[PDB]
Scaffold this active site. Structure first.
Site, mmCIF file in Angstrom:
data_model
loop_
_atom_site.group_PDB
_atom_site.id
_atom_site.type_symbol
_atom_site.label_atom_id
_atom_site.label_comp_id
_atom_site.label_asym_id
_atom_site.label_seq_id
_atom_site.Cartn_x
_atom_site.Cartn_y
_atom_site.Cartn_z
ATOM 1 N N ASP A 226 -52.668 43.699 -5.980
ATOM 2 C CA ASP A 226 -51.329 43.486 -6.523
ATOM 3 C C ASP A 226 -50.401 42.682 -5.591
ATOM 4 O OD1 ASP A 226 -48.969 43.704 -8.022
ATOM 5 O OD2 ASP A 226 -48.580 45.742 -7.356
ATOM 6 N N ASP B 186 -47.586 36.903 -9.224
ATOM 7 C CA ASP B 186 -47.951 38.313 -9.357
ATOM 8 C C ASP B 186 -49.317 38.582 -9.983
ATOM 9 O OD1 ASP B 186 -47.918 41.000 -9.272
ATOM 10 O OD2 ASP B 186 -46.405 41.283 -10.870
HETATM 11 C C1 LIG Z 1 -52.387 44.072 -14.807
HETATM 12 C C2 LIG Z 1 -52.098 45.540 -14.628
HETATM 13 C C3 LIG Z 1 -52.669 46.458 -15.498
HETATM 14 C C4 LIG Z 1 -52.407 47.812 -15.343
HETATM 15 C C5 LIG Z 1 -51.569 48.270 -14.330
HETATM 16 C C6 LIG Z 1 -50.973 47.358 -13.462
HETATM 17 C C7 LIG Z 1 -50.084 47.869 -12.369
HETATM 18 C C8 LIG Z 1 -49.584 49.168 -12.425
HETATM 19 C C9 LIG Z 1 -48.761 49.653 -11.407
HETATM 20 C C10 LIG Z 1 -48.412 48.852 -10.323
HETATM 21 C C11 LIG Z 1 -47.572 49.405 -9.204
HETATM 22 C C12 LIG Z 1 -46.148 49.839 -9.548
HETATM 23 C C13 LIG Z 1 -46.387 48.523 -8.790
HETATM 24 C C14 LIG Z 1 -46.150 47.373 -9.708
HETATM 25 C C15 LIG Z 1 -45.386 47.552 -10.874
HETATM 26 C C16 LIG Z 1 -45.150 46.481 -11.743
HETATM 27 O O1 LIG Z 1 -44.470 46.628 -12.797
HETATM 28 N N1 LIG Z 1 -45.694 45.218 -11.411
HETATM 29 C C17 LIG Z 1 -45.466 44.091 -12.325
HETATM 30 C C18 LIG Z 1 -46.464 45.076 -10.222
HETATM 31 N N2 LIG Z 1 -47.004 43.878 -9.883
HETATM 32 N N3 LIG Z 1 -46.666 46.151 -9.411
HETATM 33 C C19 LIG Z 1 -48.944 47.561 -10.261
HETATM 34 C C20 LIG Z 1 -49.763 47.063 -11.277
HETATM 35 C C21 LIG Z 1 -51.256 45.990 -13.609
#
Ligand SMILES: Cc1cccc(-c2ccc([C@@H]3C[C@@H]3c3cc(=O)n(C)c(N)n3)cc2)c1
Length: 358
Positions: free
Chosen positions: A34, A219
């Site tokens: 991420d 992202d």
């Molecule tokens: C593509 C995808 C699919 C399912 C879940 C995620 C996912 C879920 C949680 C996170 C943790 C909270 C932090 C976070 C929140 C969030 O809303 N974004 C866009 C990002 N990049 N990171 C990051 C990514 C990402």
């Protein structure tokens, strides 16, 4: 870096993950990559949807930071218990490091029912680390404790998906043509500046400040290309006109539809040099997601988000050492016979600094 080619897996829409080990002896876990966050956090309790979790009781090298963390986000949240431990990456560099680890203890709408990952690896900067900048992120800790170069790159390829996270460098076999670099504006998220937008070569002619309202980031954590409200509004209007050869809910990602009638979309990004930019161009095969398709562009309140929609068109180098991010045509992106994803420059664009927001 062949050792590391193809070290990423996933399911459509559930993100990319990389295998890691935590603790001694080493506990294998799949961890979502991420670039939009900065915490290393893993499930540490037997959540029903998880295949496996961090058992601190089995780790001789675990240390408790005697502090907790609460991470609300759009919907929903995770909480955990801070600690440290020995992290390694089986298909990465040959090193082990003591990194901070949030042991995730409570969760809501965070883990995905069906997915094959049980943790998140935040690759962004300390400034947005939870609870505060004092919590050194994994990659900061990696570079400090080894000679691994301060740089990583991703080629996301896209049920099953795949890609490569090259840690510490660049695998030239992963791209064609040249890399072009945009400056990382502030080291928190990976913020950049969009300087122009075109649909089928036609400028949107908006104050370019509206493209970065109030932020634009790269992202790997997002599926969509997400535009601010105003921009998306104009974006879509123009995409609609181009595509005059569908119901409004669709454009809003409320419904589904079931190539050439669709316009390529170009983003000009601030270049490395004063009054100089370049542009990345993606095809519909990229903003139309699987015969039913979802419109993969969507309005936003947090800024522009360059997600897999964009990233799956390009080899993307996060050059932290020089505060910059490079884009090259990806040697894997899906293209048809006519149009191709492209990275071209230089261009002359005046007043690029003004596109930023304060
Ligand atoms: C593509 C995808 C699919 C399912 C879940 C995620 C996912 C879920 C949680 C996170 C943790 C909270 C932090 C976070 C929140 C969030 O809303 N974004 C866009 C990002 N990049 N990171 C990051 C990514 C990402």
């Amino acid at each position: 870096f062949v050792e590391m080619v193809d070290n990423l897996r996933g399911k459509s829409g559930q993100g990319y993950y990389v295998e890691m080990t935590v603790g001694s002896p080493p506990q294998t876990l799949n961890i979502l990559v991420d670039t939009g966050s900065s915490n290393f956090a893993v499930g540490a309790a037997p959540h029903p949807f998880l295949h496996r979790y961090y058992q601190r009781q089995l780790s001789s090298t675990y240390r408790d930071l005697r502090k907790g963390v609460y991470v609300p986000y759009t919907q929903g949240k995770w909480e955990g218990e801070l600690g440290t431990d020995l992290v390694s990456i089986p298909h990465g560099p040959n090193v082990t490091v003591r990194a901070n680890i949030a042991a995730i203890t409570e969760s809501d709408k965070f883990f995905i029912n069906g997915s094959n990952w049980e943790g998140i690896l935040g690759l962004a900067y300390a400034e947005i680390a939870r609870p505060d900048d004092s919590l050194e992120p994994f990659f900061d800790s990696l570079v400090k404790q080894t000679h691994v170069p301060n740089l990583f790159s991703l080629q996301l390829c896209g049920a099953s998906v795949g890609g490569s996270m090259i840690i510490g460098g660049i695998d030239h076999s992963l791209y064609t043509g040249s890399l072009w670099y945009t400056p990382i504006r502030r080291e928190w998220y990976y913020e950049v500046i969009i300087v122009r937008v075109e649909i089928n070569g036609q400028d949107l002619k908006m104050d370019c400040k509206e493209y970065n309202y109030d932020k634009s980031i790269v992202d790997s954590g997002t599926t969509n290309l997400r535009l601010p409200k105003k921009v998306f509004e104009a974006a879509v209007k123009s995409i609609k006109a181009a595509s005059s050869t569908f119901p409004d809910g669709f454009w809003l990602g409320e419904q589904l539809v079931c190539w050439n009638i669709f316009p390529v979309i170009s983003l000009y990004l601030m270049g490395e040099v004063t009054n100089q930019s370049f542009r990345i161009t993606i095809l519909p095969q990229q903003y139309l997601r699987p015969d039913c398709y979802k419109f993969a562009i969507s309005q936003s309140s947090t800024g522009t988000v360059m997600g897999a929609v964009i990233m799956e068109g390009f080899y993307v180098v996060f050059d932290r050492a020089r505060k910059r991010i490079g884009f090259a045509v990806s040697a894997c992106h899906v293209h048809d016979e006519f149009r191709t994803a492209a990275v071209e420059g230089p261009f002359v664009t005046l007043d690029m600094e003004d596109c930023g927001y304060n």
